[PDB]
Ligand binder design. Sequence first.
Ligand SMILES: Cc1cc2nc3c(=O)[nH]c(=O)nc-3n(C[C@H](O)[C@H](O)[C@H](O)COP(=O)(O)OP(=O)(O)OC[C@H]3O[C@@H](n4cnc5c(N)ncnc54)[C@H](O)[C@@H]3O)c2cc1C
Ligand SMILES: Cc1cc2nc3c(=O)[nH]c(=O)nc-3n(C[C@H](O)[C@H](O)[C@H](O)COP(=O)(O)OP(=O)(O)OC[C@H]3O[C@@H](n4cnc5c(N)ncnc54)[C@H](O)[C@@H]3O)c2cc1C
Ligand SMILES: [Ca+2]
Ligand SMILES: [Cl-]
Ligand SMILES: [Cl-]
Ligand SMILES: [Pt+2]
Ligand SMILES: [Pt+2]
Ligand SMILES: [Pt+2]
Ligand SMILES: [Pt+2]
Ligand SMILES: [Pt+2]
Ligand SMILES: [Pt+2]
Lengths: 655, 658
Amino acid sequence: EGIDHLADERNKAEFDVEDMKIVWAGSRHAFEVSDRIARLVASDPVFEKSNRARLSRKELFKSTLRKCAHAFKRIIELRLNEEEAGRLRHFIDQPAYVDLHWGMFVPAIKGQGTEEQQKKWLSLANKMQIIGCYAQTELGHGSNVQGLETTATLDPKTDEFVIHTPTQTASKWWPGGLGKVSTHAVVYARLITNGKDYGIHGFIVQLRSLEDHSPLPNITVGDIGTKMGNGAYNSMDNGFLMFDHVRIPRDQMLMRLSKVTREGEYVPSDVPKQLVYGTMVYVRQTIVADASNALSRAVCIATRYSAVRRQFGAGIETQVIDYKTQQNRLFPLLASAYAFRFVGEWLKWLYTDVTERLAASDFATLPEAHACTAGLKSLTTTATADGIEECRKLCGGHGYLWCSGLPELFAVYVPACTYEGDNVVLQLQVARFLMKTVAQLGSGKVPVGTTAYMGRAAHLLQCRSGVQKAEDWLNPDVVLEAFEARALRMAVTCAKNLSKFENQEQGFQELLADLVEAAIAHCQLIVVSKFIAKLEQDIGGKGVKKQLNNLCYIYALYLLHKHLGDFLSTNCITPKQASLANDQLRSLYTQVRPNAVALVDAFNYTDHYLNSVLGRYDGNVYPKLFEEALKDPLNDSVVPDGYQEYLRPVLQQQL
Amino acid sequence: EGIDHLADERNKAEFDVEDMKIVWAGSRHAFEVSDRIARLVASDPVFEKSNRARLSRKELFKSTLRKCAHAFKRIIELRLNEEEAGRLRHFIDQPAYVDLHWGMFVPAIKGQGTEEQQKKWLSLANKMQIIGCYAQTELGHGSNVQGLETTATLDPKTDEFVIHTPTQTASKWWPGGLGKVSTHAVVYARLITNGKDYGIHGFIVQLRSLEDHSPLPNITVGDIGTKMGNGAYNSMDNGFLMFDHVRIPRDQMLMRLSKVTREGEYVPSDVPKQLVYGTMVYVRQTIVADASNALSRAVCIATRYSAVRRQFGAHNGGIETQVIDYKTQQNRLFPLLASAYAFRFVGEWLKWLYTDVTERLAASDFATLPEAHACTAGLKSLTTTATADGIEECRKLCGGHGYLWCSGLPELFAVYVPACTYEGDNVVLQLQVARFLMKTVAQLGSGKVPVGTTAYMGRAAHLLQCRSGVQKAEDWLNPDVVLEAFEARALRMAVTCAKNLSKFENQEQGFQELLADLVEAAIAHCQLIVVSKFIAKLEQDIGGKGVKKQLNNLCYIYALYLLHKHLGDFLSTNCITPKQASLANDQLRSLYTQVRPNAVALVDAFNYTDHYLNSVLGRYDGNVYPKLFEEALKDPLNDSVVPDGYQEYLRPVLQQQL
Ligand SMILES: Cc1cc2nc3c(=O)[nH]c(=O)nc-3n(C[C@H](O)[C@H](O)[C@H](O)COP(=O)(O)OP(=O)(O)OC[C@H]3O[C@@H](n4cnc5c(N)ncnc54)[C@H](O)[C@@H]3O)c2cc1C
Ligand SMILES: Cc1cc2nc3c(=O)[nH]c(=O)nc-3n(C[C@H](O)[C@H](O)[C@H](O)COP(=O)(O)OP(=O)(O)OC[C@H]3O[C@@H](n4cnc5c(N)ncnc54)[C@H](O)[C@@H]3O)c2cc1C
Ligand SMILES: [Ca+2]
Ligand SMILES: [Cl-]
Ligand SMILES: [Cl-]
Ligand SMILES: [Pt+2]
Ligand SMILES: [Pt+2]
Ligand SMILES: [Pt+2]
Ligand SMILES: [Pt+2]
Ligand SMILES: [Pt+2]
Ligand SMILES: [Pt+2]
């Protein structure tokens, strides 16, 4: 019928959801564009995906190709701009070769290719005259790109590069859109010329004929197999690729940063390689933004279902969302979704700054921008992945059904923790940055940026919190001092133990676990500080900033409790004060409780996008669960196929 | 071919693996029977399951019926006993109706049926002349069984029970084997007679005809839909069931503890009601035991792959370091390896408890019933939660390749996770433990002292006011130092919750307000139990060169890991100082370095066949990369280099013909 059975929950909102929608979107323009394209996608039959778990691999892949072709057509017929086109693909919500073509193939050519190469290849790529992928990872090397085995040797006699896969472990493995779609690809391999290896470089290589799509000579290509989850990435043709002395023109090597003349000499271009932040600053900011998007979808579903599902506490039973355990599990995730959203905005400013930095030839803040962004990507993706699975558990047994929308969300998102850098490896980079920074404590150098709080090491290392009552934990200065002292203490303790070993790189390895935790503490401090900073801005809407303030401190006090041991080790926070922080946290859960549903409605997700029976906008769950069950292929017949051969003989006692 | 790439790793072992295998199995008999049946399943083509993710729902279900039928045949042709049959189904490793028939339907009739009911129905069930399922859960009620809406009203004039589904939410939902297989089922509904509701009772109801499998009159049954993961529980026909005033003979009501005369009189039997909890203590015991099974599988895979995978740390010109050498990898994996053994041993203890409770229960001795229930519920919650998270963490430990279905980890996680919800929601179960702990605290050792697993709660004297004597890292390897720390931490948290409760006018209101705190205290109590049982295990005589030593390493890794993970809880007691906490961390680090060379052998002790593990990354011989390529070729998407859909959806795009 469409009647909203959560209207009573929404009426509890102490703020206008419409205003919060703008805050979440980031601006009115962003909201309007996304909302329009979203409705557009939802109203198009070709983009349906509620039966995505009832199709075979082949059928799922073909259906994906169809959606992509249809999307391209709609973009042209509707004359959608870049922004709208990007939102269209976003709401189609189905991993496809197109994501890598536009997301890695093109960008790789723009930043690593010469102007002429860009003119030629970008012209073909932008008009879909060719389809490319990013072939970097191999069977034996993913995170350690410097260890790639694929080789590219120049042939002075033919002025061509010989691309070869020395061993089976040198085979490309994982590239999206490589398995069956891409006609071309940017292949990364060891550059070899004049009998010398000059490291990893990118080379454009045609994989398939543009006439029959058949693999070119000496090219071995295919899909790597089924991946985790029903649907999810299985719509993507992640593939492998091997070269048997494949030849490509010399000028097919991306030569913006370095080039190889006809003579075969390697010549590092005069371009500042420090401008390679197009693959590790903006890209990671989108990853951090994607985390808020993924987490918000999961929290939206779990919040609505928690307000619908009643169990125990009876006549009528209590809504599970009323239970403090449900809140202590769900509300921190709702706070994290907003926290990551805002930290994602700050990362947009950092990009505009780092870009502003590579202008005046200032590379003084690059080291911090690298570790900061790397640590944030690791922190948010990890927290988001865990939160999505937790949201599934918060839905009890029904969350185990695919139609709940949670199982596939986790499966499709989890790769974020590995691609573009293993989460642990990335945090080790932050640990190295923090150790190099602490090594400056007492040197006289004034640390700036996210490490500026290290200048107050004198006070932070010997502090004592002035907290005397629960409400004191709502003071930004009190919370910030707590997190800074915690992070500093942890980093200083690591540095001190690191000087207790003879070999520096040895002690580092021996303490990797402690180093990662110190790095995480630093990253959480950053997220907490950016949420507080966001609250200083002018946010319109009655009661809006009050709810954001509630979420800000729920996030901070939740992490305080989760990592209580770190704070208590610093002795700048006592157990009594920790207990008071816990009382404040509980009080914050109660204040947010009535605003819960409206806070996820602010995400403005359509039922089509959420693709969840439990998280339906109208709260009409149970009837929809039954409706979906009937659609399962196992219900195509009353008596199962296999009854006569494998059941009746048993029941009838005939073996 | 036949080379063992992990040969060197296995030579690093500082203990004899063959002896550790016996420890894991529990005995030489258990080990022998399992090893034999395991090989028997692996060698049978009908039991292939590495292609499971390439089957449609229908083909997967049909294949499941085939495997179960073949199992019945093999048990008869091989003349296998009950133990062997159980091990057979265990290694077939495929969720199916058979699990509920033997695991729930039968146990229900045995513990709730009358002597006359048991020999009539169990004779049918044991011979499989009927196939039953456990139909309790409904759309609207799972954890809260007392809230079930299905009704069973007696009809004196016909001597029948009228089973009915009041509303859509009253529909049975989730029962394994109900969807398409079961012909009968034990249905739970509110017993209605003489115009009174007497609560939830069990009733036997026939769902399908034994001649053509057609649903009986007024019976609406079907499958509830596709579940999380490729394969996994999708071979199981979990279903829904609605009754439109279905009628069954009055004698089809399980009447061992409750009778209903021909005149509709509700009369309790002479059998103690508590003589039913004996089965749940069993089912929960099997769940805990299952936790070690699933966790060890995941850890075996991640441990072997961690020894094969090399990344970064290149020394000898290109020779990169095995990831298992990195402390972060060890800190994430070794605690799970330690937990696998910890859960195995706590599972052994829970078995002993099952018997003990069952014995005394047969003598109307319900003195330890309250404790038995708390431990079981809490351990079921603790182990399943830790195992589920541990399995997913093992997948992340395998980096990118762990995302491939052929790594064996994605399906293992999906098939295992239901463990955190079935038999009671994990958080709900821990709240029951909290209530038990609060009552125990309420009884201040004045009336009858705390014994069993709560005995420590009696020594609140020095506990709530201790100061560990730890002065050196090595001190954290002392059992009394560890136990004292965990007992104090748990008792302290519980006593604090009790005090905070006492300051509320309405005790139930306070309980609800502090739910989160109560669950944390209950978890600390359950962890103490696991730690204490592992330490107790080491007090036994365990033969084998270096065997006990390695178990000792794991024992303290488990304890010290939890101490670190929940550091905040211990530092609040003032019985542990930050300096002593830092010493525990140093000891933990050292234990990792000691376990490192023993890692691969410690997972080989599980004695899993490659067929059972069904993992390319975790292959016994470590021949990962070549096998990954081999598996990729089997995907249907590789049936052709040019994908179907190319002509319609790719060519037109590449030619600007949209
Ligand atoms: C769905 C998906 C899509 C992808 N798409 C593409 C693509 O389009 N193009 C492309 O080129 N690639 C792609 N990739 C590959 C991806 O970008 C990464 O290169 C790859 O996932 C890195 O993981 P790995 O297997 O190398 O992990 P590893 O780096 O081998 O790590 C494995 C384990 O060892 C640990 N470890 C490793 N090194 C260290 C260290 N130094 N210290 C401590 N611990 C360490 C890790 O933490 C982890 O526990 C994709 C991957 C996935 C899963
Ligand atoms: C794969 C699978 C197979 C199953 N097979 C069977 C079967 O064969 N037969 C059968 O009868 N059933 C079966 N079940 C059902 C199962 O045994 C449980 O009854 C059911 O999964 C419990 O989940 P729920 O939906 O009731 O969760 P709920 O109990 O409703 O909980 C949902 C959320 O609310 C929270 N919550 C609920 N109550 C409280 C409370 N009092 N205090 C604080 N928080 C609370 C929970 O923590 C959770 O976060 C199966 C379930 C699954 C997933
Ligand atoms: Ca309502
Ligand atoms: Cl799934
Ligand atoms: Cl899966
Ligand atoms: Pt050039
Ligand atoms: Pt960078
Ligand atoms: Pt309705
Ligand atoms: Pt080999
Ligand atoms: Pt009877
Ligand atoms: Pt019980």
